[PDB]
């Protein structure tokens, strides 16, 4: 449920075979407690897309799959109806947890 594409995108900036390794965005995603800073963090993570797209062809592997605009839009109405911090931070830490795994980014 709209949780694996964003996990793939977050992993794409930490996994190997790349050059842009920015732990700041993934670290701040886990350590999020209010709506504004979480939205700022996700937007900052998404702004790294053009660099990844331009470096994808530098190795010949398939380009990273940027999450679809509908997936990005769903987060707005998925977070706007959460008010308690306990459930607000659960998704925040799940997003960061999904970034660390052992698949293949691109052959």
């Amino acid at each position: 449920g709209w949780i694996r594409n964003i996990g793939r995108y977050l992993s794409y900036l930490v996994d190997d075979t790349f050059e842009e390794y920015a732990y700041d965005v993934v670290d701040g995603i886990a350590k999020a407690r209010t709506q504004e800073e979480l939205l700022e963090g996700v937007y900052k993570a998404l702004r790294l897309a053009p660099k990844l797209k331009k470096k994808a062809e530098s190795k010949g592997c398939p380009p990273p799959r940027i999450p679809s605009p509908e997936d990005i839009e769903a987060l707005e109405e998925k977070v706007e109806q959460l008010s308690n911090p306990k459930d607000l931070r659960k998704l925040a830490v799940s997003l960061a947890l999904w970034a660390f795994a052992s698949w293949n980014n691109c052959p």
């Binding site: 050059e19 390794y21 920015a22 732990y23 700041d24």
Partner: protein
């Protein structure tokens, strides 16, 4: 002679005492949790800090640096010559003096007399079981509660990446902010064994000075002068590429011949008002307390010397002893 120093210093764009990523290419500053009053109750904030071990080791470095020039500088361990932080590791039972002659570790007094490395900062030799409490105690370097009150978050830290197959990009965290610090030097046991601190010859308390008294004075003055490259910048790690932008903001120092209470840390917002009482009443009880104040007004009724720098402070302390 005992002394306590405290105050607030501006560590601006520093990287001292990073947590260290080791293999990985992320370098982060050490984080500690502090409690702040705010307005709706105590809240805990994770802030960058410099552990007391860092400051203690750097003070030891300064002490060795200013004790080399003393003509009595042969009384140092070989490790202290290269600023080797370890005093006596596990396994060994002898020490290597600066001259080269071996020093036995079977007694405290011989270790005290032969080498000045273990006298000021203490030591522990587990093989022979010898131990000597350090005479210099340092606290953390935390952002002051005043600053953290109106910083309202934003993590107070920015990450900057540097470059160089052997081609990797590694990012390190840099902090800033008006921090508070406090050091205590109980420099009354210098050159005195812990086991027999007194002699009691004619049934009266007599200090058990085991070394030449002029050497004791030289060691004391060097230990106090070690504070010179503490408030000037030679503190922390990564001094090659960072060199923290340093400037002392507020400073208070108390000195005495007998035991005295530890001055309150400068981290708290209202430490000046507490210090006023803790010093005026302490002098009222009958403690010979000398007060030096830099860029702070603690009012009248206290014979505190208003000063302008840090080196005059050590100069006055040296001329006091």
């Amino acid at each position: 002679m005992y002394v306590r120093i405290s105050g607030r210093i501006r560590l601006n764009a520093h990287s001292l005492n990073a947590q260290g990523g080791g293999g990985t290419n992320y370098i982060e500053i050490t984080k500690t949790k502090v409690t702040v009053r705010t307005e709706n109750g105590w809240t805990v904030v994770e802030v960058p800090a410099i552990t007391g071990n860092m400051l203690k080791h750097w003070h030891f470095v300064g002490f060795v640096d200013y004790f080399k020039t003393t003509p009595y500088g042969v009384n140092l361990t070989e490790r202290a010559l290269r600023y080797n932080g370890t005093r006596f590791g596990q396994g060994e039972t002898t020490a290597t003096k600066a001259n080269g002659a071996t020093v036995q570790l079977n007694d405290e007094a011989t270790i005290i007399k032969e080498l000045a490395d273990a006298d000021v900062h203490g030591f522990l030799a587990p093989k022979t079981g010898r131990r000597r409490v350090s005479l210099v105690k340092a606290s953390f370097i935390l952002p002051t509660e005043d600053f953290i009150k109106e910083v309202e978050g934003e993590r107070l830290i920015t990450a900057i990446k540097h470059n160089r197959t052997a081609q990797m990009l590694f990012s390190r965290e840099y902090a800033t902010g008006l921090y508070g610090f406090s050091i205590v030097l109980d420099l009354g046991l210098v050159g005195i064994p812990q086991g027999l601190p007194v002699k009691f010859e004619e049934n009266q308390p007599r200090p058990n000075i085991v070394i030449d008294p002029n050497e004791r004075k030289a060691r004391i003055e060097s230990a106090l002068k070690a504070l010179i490259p503490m408030l000037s910048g030679y503190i922390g790690a990564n001094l090659a590429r960072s060199f923290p932008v340093f400037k002392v903001e507020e400073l208070v120092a108390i000195a005495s011949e007998g035991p005295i209470p530890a001055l309150v840390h400068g981290f708290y917002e209202d430490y000046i008002e507490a210090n006023r009482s803790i010093i005026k009443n302490a002098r009222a009880l009958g403690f010979n307390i000398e007060v030096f104040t830099y860029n702070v007004d603690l009012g009248e009724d206290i014979e505190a010397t208003k000063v302008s720098s840090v080196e005059e402070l050590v100069a006055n302390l040296v001329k006091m002893v």
